[PDB]
Design a protein around this ligand. Structure first.
Ligand SMILES: O=S(=O)(Nc1cc(Cl)c(Oc2cnc3ccccc3c2)c(Cl)c1)c1ccc(Cl)cc1Cl
Ligand SMILES: [Cl-]
Lengths: 12, 256
C-alpha cells in the first residue's frame, strides 16, 4: 500500500 | 564545465534545503550560542520546567512522533527536488524514503544538539540531555546514542550547504532492500558524491580527510537506526498502543 508516502510523493 | 555543473547542483540543493526546512543549522547555532535578538529558549530540565513549557516518558515519545511526521513531510519535499528523483519508479521512491528517512532525521537533529541538550518547538525550547536520560526504560535509552553521535559529528563543522548534499547522497542509496531498478539510483548517487567531494574541498579546504570521515558517518548512521528500530520493536511488543500516525506505521512496517 504505502498510500500515505505515495500521496506525499505526488502532491504538487 | 563539469565542475560548473557540480556547483550548480550544490547550489540547487542548498536553495531547495532552505525552501524545504524552516529551521536550518545556521539559525539553530545562533539560538544555541545566544547570538540572536530572539528571547533565550525556554529550558526543560524536569517536571517543573516541562509543566510550565499519559506518563511523562510517553508524552515525550509522542511529541517526538508528531515532530517526526512533519520531518518526513519536509524530507519528502526535499527528496522531490533532487534532480532525477521524481522520474524514478514510484515504488523505488517509496523504498528510498522508508529506509532512509530516519538516517536524515538524526543527521539533521544533530544541528539542533550540543553535549547538554537539544532544541525543540522550532528553537523555542531546549530539552536537556540529563532530563531525557532520566526517562524510564526504554524511553531514556533513545537519545543517549544520538548525543554520542552528534557531539562527534558536530565537531566536523558542516554548514547547511554541506548537509544538503550529504543528505541527498544518503537518500539515493542503491543498497536498500527491495529496490527494483538499482542502476539509475547509483547513477544519481555517483553524481551526488562527486558534488559532495568538490563542496568539501572548496568549503573545508583544510579539514583532514573530511570526505572519508563523512562516508564513515553514513555507516555510523545505519547502526544508530538499527538500534533505534530495535527499541521501537520492544515498545511495540511490550508497551500499550501509542496510536501511531498512519504515515509512521507504513515506514515502521518494513524495517521492524
Ligand atoms: O531521540 S529520539 O530517538 N528522537 C527524537 C528526539 C527529538 Cl528531541 C526530536 O525532536 C523533538 C522536537 N520537538 C518536540 C516537541 C515536544 C516534544 C518532543 C519533541 C521532540 C525528534 Cl523529532 C526525535 C527520542 C528521544 C526520546 C524519546 Cl521518549 C523518544 C525518541 Cl523517538
Ligand atoms: Cl520517566
Amino acid at each position: 500500500t504505502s498510500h500515505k508516502l505515495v500521496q506525499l510523493l505526488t502532491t504538487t | 564545465p563539469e565542475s560548473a555543473d557540480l556547483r550548480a547542483l550544490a547550489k540547487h540543493l542548498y536553495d531547495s534545503y532552505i525552501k524545504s526546512f524552516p529551521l536550518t543549522k545556521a539559525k539553530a547555532r545562533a539560538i544555541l550560542t545566544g547570538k540572536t535578538t530572539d528571547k533565550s529558549p525556554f529550558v526543560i530540565y524536569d517536571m517543573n520546567s516541562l509543566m510550565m513549557g499519559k506518563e511523562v516518558a510517553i508524552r515525550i515519545f509522542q511529541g517526538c512522533q508528531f515532530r517526526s511526521v512533519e520531518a518526513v513531510q519536509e524530507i519528502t519535499e526535499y527528496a522531490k527536488s533532487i534532480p532525477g528523483f521524481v522520474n524514478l519508479d514510484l515504488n523505488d521512491q517509496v523504498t528510498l524514503l522508508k529506509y532512509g528517512v530516519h538516517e536524515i532525521i538524526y543527521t539533521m537533529l544533530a544541528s539542533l544538539m550540543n553535549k547538554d541538550g537539544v532544541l525543540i518547538s522550532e528553537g523555542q525550547g531546549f530539552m536537556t540531555r540529563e532530563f531525557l536520560k532520566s526517562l524510564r526504560k526504554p524511553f531514556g535509552d533513545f537519545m543517549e546514542p544520538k548525543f554520542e553521535f552528534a557531539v562527534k559529528f558536530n565537531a566536523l563543522e558542516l554548514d547547511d550547504s554541506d548537509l544538503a548534499i550529504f543528505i541527498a547522497v544518503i537518500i539515493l542509496s542503491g543498497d536498500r532492500p527491495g529496490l527494483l531498478n538499482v542502476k539509475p539510483i547509483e547513477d544519481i548517487q555517483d553524481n551526488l558524491l562527486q558534488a559532495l567531494e568538490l563542496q568539501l574541498k572548496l568549503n573545508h579546504p583544510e579539514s583532514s580527510q573530511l570526505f572519508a570521515k563523512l562516508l564513515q558517518k553514513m555507516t555510523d548512521l545505519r547502526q544508530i537506526v538499527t538500534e533505534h528500530v530495535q527499541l521501537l520493536q520492544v515498545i511495540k511488543k511490550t508497551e500499550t498502543d501509542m496510536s501511531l500516525h498512519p504515515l509512521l506505521q507504513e515506514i515502521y512496517k518494513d524495517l521492524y
